[PDB]
Write a protein that binds this ligand. Structure first.
Ligand code: U04
Lengths: 99, 99
């Protein structure tokens, strides 16, 4: 889906089968989502946002399906205000930003 | 201009002739930058990001020159670790996400 940015780039994706609404964020290097139970193969990590740092759990090689393409990427679960799909997933989707 | 997202999309923006380095962010609605003087017709606002809330001064209708185009958009200034150009500027530039 070509994304005219007139409407916030929000989409529904499946993170290991569970559907979640995520924001396509070209400013974030990482992806972070609240509320899904991905498991016990984690590693506490810290992600620094624009307002401060939050503790998160890093999950490697997770199956993600968004915009009809399946990818495997690192997702971090934490107490985040909005769910964000960062550049690590956008690049795996082959997503670019055009002018 | 196309921007693969392999690297953070950081460009140099001239806001009222003052050069700043801004991160092109699709996820953000507003644009925030620090270290620039925009005058005295502002409105104090609060923006919520990952990690916390940010105090800002909002300036409407400012001349911005970035990616070879000139626009008039609202810019917020605040003590942010990273200058972000959000959707309000990206729509004005005519940018779109792709694939
Ligand atoms: C602009 C930052 C960015 C973000 C999101 C998710 C993870 C990370 N973290 C990274 O992947 C990059 N981290 C990084 O550059 O670290 C700092 C200390 C220099 C900021 C950053 C970011 C937003 O798009 C954003 C968009 C809408 C609302 C609040 C937001 O609130 C943010 O914070």
């Amino acid at each position: 889906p070509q994304f005219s940015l007139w409407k916030r780039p929000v989409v529904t994706a499946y993170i290991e089968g569970q559907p979640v609404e995520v924001l396509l964020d070209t400013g974030a290097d990482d992806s972070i989502v609240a509320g899904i139970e991905l498991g016990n193969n984690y590693s506490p990590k810290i992600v620094g946002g624009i307002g401060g740092f939050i503790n998160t759990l890093e999950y490697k090689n997770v199956e993600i399906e968004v915009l009809n393409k399946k990818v495997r990427a690192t997702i971090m679960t934490g107490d985040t205000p909005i769910n964000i799909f960062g550049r690590n997933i956008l690049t795996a989707l082959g997503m670019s930003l055009n002018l």
